[PDB]
Every structure is written in structure tokens, then in C-alpha cells.
Ligand binder design. Structure first.
Ligand SMILES: Nc1ncnc2[nH]cnc12
Ligand SMILES: Nc1ncnc2[nH]cnc12
Lengths: 214, 215
């Protein structure tokens, strides 16, 4: 059974919710998710987790001594350490598939300005480390990115459940002046597949022209 | 202040949390976030919100009747209706900046197989509709994408390119690993040059697309 440890300064934000796909996976015994308050590994009364960046600049950088202790305790040699960061390699469906068969994911959630690079560099000498971005936008921290990664990965674990997908329809056949495309009701399943391919092509050209090569 | 309405069959999941960035924005009176259970607009015993797809295929498609009623109540002509879908236009930083000035966002969260397309088509005859993907992966539903969109947008609300290279903080040596000496030198010019170089070098390795290269 997969183990996922999430380390964050926002533990209640990342607490699993029963009424959700990860909540369902947990209650099904298909994953164990544990959320850890990073402050647990702080050294001082202020529970300090970041510090000013060397070289100057706005924002803060998360402390290596704090993260170092947290990961020392939580990780083992089998761990895949996931570090969400907008400077990461792209997280894709392929990645989600790879991680879905891992025994132990640890997701280190930090502010977007980053965790001191030595944490990942050190960790990588003992375990596999993956710095990943979930998209071309900036979140204040990796917390919401962790939620996305967990959702994408867990729905691929057995038992939990190119081109763009085109429009989909269901009952009633007519609604507010709009009819479901009659081909879908034709019982000509080869034709339906061809029609769906064309819908997919048109939607991809319109919304994601990057996916068509060219 | 900005109003965000979220419609979902997972209200508990989407409930704002005080200790979070959106929680801070709410507490500061800079945004009002309301979460609505889609089942509120069902009429049948079983509170059904989806049905098998016309034409076949896996999973289920969300009923247009239920969504139609929900949006009729929540949306006005001024609403920007956001519909997260993996089949959507890309949601980007530019999008976040644009939506940070909107008076009213409504985020319609639905399973990935889709809300019946007639819903978005109908809505578009009355208001601005934006079907958007937050990345090239599949989530079971729009819920976690809504959380991401709310995060990306609210941090840009007043009052609340290239990849950034590595960052460092104290102490200067840790487990035998030293902070790059230029960063300790106080030479703003050399530091800026070093950071620019690290940025370009990380970008070419991790995101060559950003510099107009393949992959
Ligand atoms: N786009 C992003 N991806 C992963 N982690 C992040 N933290 C802040 N923004 C992020
Ligand atoms: N990648 C994605 N972006 C937006 N909404 C989604 N719903 C399921 N997957 C999604």
C-alpha cells in the first residue's frame, strides 16, 4: 500500500478530506496519507522555517537545517522525494503514471521562492529527488501543487476508481434549444469514433495548437 | 471586493481554510469565497448529478439540467464563468493576472469526462465563459484545479518567462556543501549576472520550450 507523506507549514490546508478522491482512496486502504507540520523540525521559539536569501532580493528562502532534519526523519532510501516548484521539470500524465507505482512518496511543500538548493542536492545523494512544476503560473507555495499531484497520481492506483477529448453529452436529447449531435444516437459506432476524432481535432486546433506539432 | 463562487459535489473539500493564502485574503476582506453543493439544485431522491454518455465511452457526464439551474441562480451577465477541464485553453500566469481584476468568478467544478457541453454553450450566450486546463495531466474532477486557480489569482489581488535558479540561505556551509561564493560577496552586479546565468541554464535543461527550443 502506497505511503504519501506531505510536509508543509500549512497542515490544516492539506489535511485529507473524506469526501474526495484521496479521501476515498485512504478509506479504501489503497493509500496512507500523512501530513506533517514542518514547524515540528524547527530549532527556535519562533519556529523559523525561512531566512533571507544570500545575494539579496525579495522574499525568503526555506532553511536547510530545518528541511534537512525533517527529510532525515521522514525519508528512507526507497523514497521518491517530490519537490513542487515553478522552476521544476514539467509534471505530466507520464509522471503521474510512473509515481502511481511508487511505495513511498514524500512531498516537500515550500514557498515558491524556494528551499535552499542544498536540501535537494544532499537528499539526491541518498534517494531519488524530483523537482516539478504543475504549470506555467506561480502559487505562493507548493501546497496546492501537492494536492494536484496527489489527485493525478492516486486516480491511477488500481482500485481507486496527443489530442484533446471533445465535447460530451447525456440526457435529455434536447435541452434549452440544443440537441445532442444525432450521430451519437445513431448506433453506428465506427462513425461515432470518427466523429469524435474530428471533434477532438477541431478542439485541439482551437484550444491547444501546440499539441499538433506544426 | 472580489466574489468567488465555487460549485462542486465536493463542498467539504473546497471549503476555505483560515491558515492558507486564500484564507488570509478572506480574513483581510479582500475576497469573499462561497462554496455551493451542486446537489442543492437536484430534485430527485438520489440527488443525481450525472448520467452515462450519449454515444458510449467510459465514466459519466454531468447532467445539463442540474448545472443549468445552479448557474442560473449564481451567475449574472457580469460573471466570468470558469470551467476547469483538461480539454481547456491553458490557464497561465497571464490568465491569473487578468482574472485578478474580475469582480465575480464562478468556478464550475465537474468530473473530467465532462459537464454536458450544452451547459457551457448555453452560459456563453449570457456571460463570459472560460474553459481552462491547469496542466497536461488528468485529475478526476475540476476541484483541485479550482484550488490552484484560486491560489494563482488571489496572490495577485492588490493588498493580498524564465525559470528562477537555485536559492540559498544561512548557514554558508551545511553538511559539507557551500553556498556559491558570489552570493556571499555583496557584489550586486556579479550576483545579478550569476543569477541570470543560472536561470538561463536551468531553463534550457528543464524547460527548453520557454526559450523557443524543442521538447
Ligand atoms: N506552478 C507551480 N508548480 C509547482 N509548485 C509550485 N509552487 C508555486 N508554484 C508552483
Ligand atoms: N488538468 C486539468 N485542468 C483543469 N481541470 C481539470 N480537471 C481534470 N483535470 C484537469
Amino acid at each position: 500500500s502506497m505511503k504519501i507523506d506531505v510536509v508543509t507549514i500549512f497542515p490544516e490546508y492539506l489535511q485529507p478530506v473524506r469526501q474526495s478522491l484521496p479521501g476515498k482512496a485512504i478509506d479504501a486502504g489503497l493509500v496512507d496519507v500523512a501530513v506533517h507540520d514542518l514547524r515540528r523540525w524547527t530549532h527556535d521559539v519562533h519556529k523559523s522555517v525561512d531566512d533571507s536569501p544570500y545575494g539579496g532580493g525579495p522574499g525568503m528562502v526555506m532553511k536547510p537545517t530545518v528541511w534537512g532534519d525533517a527529510l532525515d526523519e521522514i525519508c528512507t532510501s526507497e523514497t521518491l522525494l517530490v519537490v513542487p516548484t515553478p522552476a521544476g521539470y514539467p509534471f505530466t500524465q507520464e509522471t503521474a503514471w510512473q509515481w502511481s507505482t511508487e511505495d513511498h512518496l514524500v512531498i516537500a511543500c515550500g514557498r515558491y521562492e524556494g528551499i535552499d538548493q542544498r536540501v535537494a542536492d544532499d537528499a539526491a545523494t541518498r534517494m531519488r529527488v524530483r523537482e516539478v512544476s504543475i504549470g506555467d503560473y506561480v502559487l505562493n507555495g507548493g501546497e496546492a501543487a501537492a494536492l494536484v499531484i496527489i489527485e493525478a497520481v492516486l486516480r491511477l492506483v488500481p482500485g481507486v476508481l496527443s489530442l484533446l477529448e471533445g465535447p460530451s453529452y447525456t440526457r435529455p436529447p434536447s435541452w434549452r434549444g440544443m440537441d445532442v449531435p444525432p450521430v451519437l444516437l445513431s448506433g453506428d459506432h465506427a462513425k461515432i469514433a470518427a466523429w469524435r476524432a474530428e471533434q477532438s481535432r477541431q478542439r485541439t486546433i482551437e484550444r491547444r495548437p501546440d499539441l499538433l506539432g506544426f
